[PDB]
């Protein structure tokens, strides 16, 4: 079966990498966020000396940047921050065209709609919130929301079932109808708080995880539970492959992949030892992205680096 190998590393940051984002429109470009308050745009290269260079940096947020996402045309990017404010960036000039305001705390995740005509966000303020791209808020979920911090929000990629999924510190996963503005279904099972939720590109399955170290699968349209996978110590991020039936997870200092035909671990990715006089000797992995080609993986870390892996035979 297929096996990963280390390609190279990217060095231009002064705090933990918080997220990475990519598109099929520009395969020599990637974009990433950090606790150093700024978003970096990278020029990738196939040169033997170093795999990429910081090309531009976006500087307008006043605290940490928590989430970042790119428009399907590759012209614009959207981001949230621990300053409670949400911003839309023109990638050609490196300037914000609009600013979104109306949360009263601290913003943990954001997404674009699959048509890119609507925006959704989640926060420590306990409210999910919906926005028009002209910067005006359109609905607020209030009493039916999570009882604790809203950790993540995501869209289904398909057009024929317009719904969103979410996870929170009250250890529930919830599913919501877009046009009707209402809750559809709870899912219950996890013992710890939740860090992440994700959906397969065919629009069929969820995955979710957090402190309990378990990845649990769920149906989007059949409304029911599927099998549980033990990850290890903790789950920081999850993603499906774009062209294989694989789930991938970032788990403490290591990254891991499951082949879902026969439910088996393909490989686990680890770092060369730097001897350290304390517990948690290696730095942890914080975020993942597969390239639009499917053949290469980007991963971010608490040691201010992005590490790149290829597939091999």
């Amino acid at each position: 079966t297929e096996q990963m190998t280390l390609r190279g590393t990217l060095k231009g940051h002064n705090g933990w990498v918080t997220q990475i984002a990519t598109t099929p429109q520009f395969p020599d470009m990637i974009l990433s966020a950090s606790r150093d308050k700024t978003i970096i745009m990278w020029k990738l290269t196939r040169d033997e000396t170093n795999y990429g260079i910081p090309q531009r940096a976006l500087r307008g947020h006043s605290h940490f940047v928590s989430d970042v996402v790119i428009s399907s045309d590759g012209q614009f990017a959207l981001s949230g921050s621990w300053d409670g404010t949400l911003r839309l960036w023109d990638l050609t000039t490196g300037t914000t065209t609009r600013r979104f305001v109306g949360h009263t705390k601290d913003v943990l995740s954001v997404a674009f709609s699959s048509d890119n005509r609507q925006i959704v966000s989640g926060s420590r303020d306990k409210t999910i919130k919906l926005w028009n791209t002209l910067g005006v808020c359109k609905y607020t979920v209030q009493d039916e929301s999570h009882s604790e911090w809203v950790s993540c929000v995501r869209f289904s990629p398909n057009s024929s079932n317009p719904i969103i999924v979410s996870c929170g510190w009250d250890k529930l996963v919830k599913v919501w109808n877009l046009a009707n503005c209402k809750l559809k279904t709870n899912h219950i099972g996890h013992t710890g708080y939740l860090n992440t939720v994700t959906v397969s590109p065919d629009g069929s399955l969820c995955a979710s995880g957090g402190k309990d170290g378990q990845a649990m699968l769920w149906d989007l349209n059949e409304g029911k539970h599927l099998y549980t996978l033990d990850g290890g110590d903790i789950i920081n991020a999850l993603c499906f492959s774009p062209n294989r039936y694989w789930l991938c997870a970032a788990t403490g200092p290591s990254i891991k992949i499951w082949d879902l035909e026969g439910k088996i671990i393909v490989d686990e990715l680890k770092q060369e030892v730097i001897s350290t006089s304390s517990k948690a000797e290696p730095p942890q992995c914080t975020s993942l992205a597969w390239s639009a080609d499917g053949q290469t993986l980007f991963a971010g870390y608490t040691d201010n680096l992005v590490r790149v892996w290829q597939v091999t035979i």
């Binding site: 209402k182 809750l183 559809k184 279904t185 709870n186 899912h187 219950i188 099972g189 996890h190 013992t191 649990m216 769920w218 409304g223 029911k224 539970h225 549980t228």
Partner: protein, 65 residues
């Protein structure tokens, strides 16, 4: 905190042998709203909210509206 938790007065009284002094000081109770005392707490009085009503066991289930 002395500027809002302590109430004070000073007075004189004249008796046949001369003046005596009186001084009075009172320390007020904290009153969140009701005007018996100040609404602002003392600077080193931290208080912790109690955890409630959790269930320890779980098993995976789904619940539609």
């Amino acid at each position: 905190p002395v500027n809002y938790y302590v109430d004070t007065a000073v007075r004189h009284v004249l008796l046949r042998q001369g003046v005596l002094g009186i001084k009075v000081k009172i320390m007020l109770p904290w009153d969140p709203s009701g005007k018996i005392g100040p609404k602002k707490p003392l600077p080193d009085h931290v208080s912790i909210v109690e955890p409630k009503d959790e269930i320890l066991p779980t098993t995976p289930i789904s619940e539609q509206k």
